[PDB]
């Protein structure tokens, strides 16, 4: 489990920053996104032009232009990011939690941690010589 | 785009064709979109570096050559192998932990371990209950297929005739000269070629040698320098001229 | 056995080069990042303004050109901006202290000699010297 | 784990207070920020001067002028702070959690705490 190389560590932290961008854009996109629309008409000096329109109709043409003539990629950018970064999390997470080769790794790290742990390998690694150990680490090494 | 141009079928309801429409948020989505793809190209670029190591320097037995070249470097030469690519990932973690694994794996090392298991798992009451026999105090690893001699053997000086059929001990510990009562030695079905200064110990100790059923190669040559031997037992020298 | 482990440590470390070079590169990019940002941020503080004027291309849709524009929040961004860079300059001064410690006395071998002079004090004199820079960090904790 | 010097401790507290200001400005900047604009026109006494505008024209010139004629630093100040303080926290945390030198540290503090615990060296140190 602590066998992962460095680039898979970068994959984890870049992954969680990536989904943090996703949840930021999704939240902001829900509560603050709108569109402002008003018609182009032509295609004591300065006075304000006036339209005979209404707050009603502004909200209506807001919804019509916002649904129709706006790009779906700008509509659904955080959802593509969110779903798509879960593809990446499913890559590394699913590769490691594949069942049978995960059993290979679990068995492997169990004998690996004991293989770090054995002080007889400290002894036998450390060196016609003698030296008498005790019993049960012999059994453990058996 | 920040500022889009809308033109829809609304004119019977509001009476206008074209709508200048500002989207107040596209600059924010634009900058974090560019920040997003910047994050992805850094991400997948490192993934390409993983692939470049996958095709550049990674095989199925390359770490096995690191084991055995490391073992020739580590003075315990002949080490077997178990799968290298998972071992390659821990080779990228540290070769120190690779060194722990191979040094445990060598059969000379675990041979020494089970030899020590023999050394603390033959006890004084065992050979104590194997002491006195036909004429004298005679001990048997004879017909017992033991892999090594116990070290409590040279504990108990009461022994006089030792019986050592079927044992792979090429070496005897030098502390065997503590057995000053031992003078008759049975060394058959074995190849004890001690290579220790204990031969001078038994140069002035013993008088009887038994080399039964021993073939042409398995006659320990350096052993017969002890010039106080008096009787010799050479059954099974199936020898031509 | 722990003495054998220390003897193993004495072998495999080989005076710890990668943790020194890694630590040195990460603290030096931290310092130059600090200098870079305090440059442009002090260059942009006065560009925060409460009340700005506006002259855009909106004449055809409204009929006007210039707009008095009050931003109701710039005083709040201004006070936590100046408060912010006060926090940053305190942080970067600490970064300078670490870099001056690096350049002043800490080396590959300086705590090697602390072992040797401290062993001349502790009167078990002839002691060898495992790796100093990590030991300098513990020398920063305590000589105990 | 407790091999960190004291100045990295103050680095940690400066880091978390720093991004606490960042998330404060980010939250406040999203949910409350707007701009108020109105035209300069000339360039029984007091009456109300009046314009001829509608509500969303006013909202439109808010959006257009807010995007165009305002400094990006004044816009994205908490985001530059938030991203930039992640660079600092990533530096110190990166050095501690680079893999192979983390194996060096984990290995060393392992044997070092054993050296702290050894009662013979307590005794032989006491003599």
PDB file of C-alpha atoms in Angstrom, chain A residues 39-90:
ATOM      1  CA  UNK A  39     -32.197  43.646 -28.072  1.00  0.00           C
ATOM      2  CA  UNK A  40     -30.125  45.326 -30.699  1.00  0.00           C
ATOM      3  CA  UNK A  41     -32.601  47.552 -32.455  1.00  0.00           C
ATOM      4  CA  UNK A  42     -31.026  49.624 -35.218  1.00  0.00           C
ATOM      5  CA  UNK A  43     -29.329  46.705 -36.950  1.00  0.00           C
ATOM      6  CA  UNK A  44     -29.615  67.629 -23.383  1.00  0.00           C
ATOM      7  CA  UNK A  45     -27.163  65.993 -25.752  1.00  0.00           C
ATOM      8  CA  UNK A  46     -27.045  62.421 -24.499  1.00  0.00           C
ATOM      9  CA  UNK A  47     -30.335  61.021 -23.248  1.00  0.00           C
ATOM     10  CA  UNK A  48     -31.165  57.490 -22.219  1.00  0.00           C
ATOM     11  CA  UNK A  49     -32.788  55.289 -24.817  1.00  0.00           C
ATOM     12  CA  UNK A  50     -35.938  53.513 -23.691  1.00  0.00           C
ATOM     13  CA  UNK A  51     -37.549  50.200 -24.557  1.00  0.00           C
ATOM     14  CA  UNK A  52     -41.219  49.424 -24.052  1.00  0.00           C
ATOM     15  CA  UNK A  53     -40.339  46.118 -22.434  1.00  0.00           C
ATOM     16  CA  UNK A  54     -40.831  44.569 -19.038  1.00  0.00           C
ATOM     17  CA  UNK A  55     -38.996  42.777 -16.241  1.00  0.00           C
ATOM     18  CA  UNK A  56     -41.176  39.790 -17.197  1.00  0.00           C
ATOM     19  CA  UNK A  57     -39.925  39.630 -20.749  1.00  0.00           C
ATOM     20  CA  UNK A  58     -36.315  40.193 -19.767  1.00  0.00           C
ATOM     21  CA  UNK A  59     -36.437  37.072 -17.653  1.00  0.00           C
ATOM     22  CA  UNK A  60     -38.135  35.259 -20.519  1.00  0.00           C
ATOM     23  CA  UNK A  61     -35.617  36.230 -23.181  1.00  0.00           C
ATOM     24  CA  UNK A  62     -32.957  35.415 -20.597  1.00  0.00           C
ATOM     25  CA  UNK A  63     -34.208  31.845 -20.425  1.00  0.00           C
ATOM     26  CA  UNK A  64     -34.699  31.521 -24.177  1.00  0.00           C
ATOM     27  CA  UNK A  65     -31.269  32.773 -25.204  1.00  0.00           C
ATOM     28  CA  UNK A  66     -29.632  31.026 -22.253  1.00  0.00           C
ATOM     29  CA  UNK A  67     -31.002  27.660 -23.219  1.00  0.00           C
ATOM     30  CA  UNK A  68     -30.841  27.973 -26.990  1.00  0.00           C
ATOM     31  CA  UNK A  69     -27.988  30.097 -28.256  1.00  0.00           C
ATOM     32  CA  UNK A  70     -25.250  29.267 -25.792  1.00  0.00           C
ATOM     33  CA  UNK A  71     -22.596  26.601 -26.064  1.00  0.00           C
ATOM     34  CA  UNK A  72     -23.219  23.343 -24.221  1.00  0.00           C
ATOM     35  CA  UNK A  73     -19.543  23.117 -23.309  1.00  0.00           C
ATOM     36  CA  UNK A  74     -19.828  26.367 -21.390  1.00  0.00           C
ATOM     37  CA  UNK A  75     -23.060  25.068 -19.878  1.00  0.00           C
ATOM     38  CA  UNK A  76     -21.641  21.763 -18.694  1.00  0.00           C
ATOM     39  CA  UNK A  77     -17.936  22.445 -18.155  1.00  0.00           C
ATOM     40  CA  UNK A  78     -17.817  21.465 -14.429  1.00  0.00           C
ATOM     41  CA  UNK A  79     -19.802  18.310 -15.064  1.00  0.00           C
ATOM     42  CA  UNK A  80     -17.418  17.183 -17.785  1.00  0.00           C
ATOM     43  CA  UNK A  81     -14.528  17.959 -15.450  1.00  0.00           C
ATOM     44  CA  UNK A  82     -16.181  16.184 -12.509  1.00  0.00           C
ATOM     45  CA  UNK A  83     -17.194  13.007 -14.335  1.00  0.00           C
ATOM     46  CA  UNK A  84     -13.964  12.986 -16.289  1.00  0.00           C
ATOM     47  CA  UNK A  85     -11.702  13.283 -13.274  1.00  0.00           C
ATOM     48  CA  UNK A  86     -13.599  10.393 -11.700  1.00  0.00           C
ATOM     49  CA  UNK A  87     -12.450   8.420 -14.732  1.00  0.00           C
ATOM     50  CA  UNK A  88      -8.897   9.098 -13.552  1.00  0.00           C
ATOM     51  CA  UNK A  89      -9.658   8.197  -9.930  1.00  0.00           C
ATOM     52  CA  UNK A  90     -11.282   4.993 -11.160  1.00  0.00           C
TER      53      UNK A  90
END
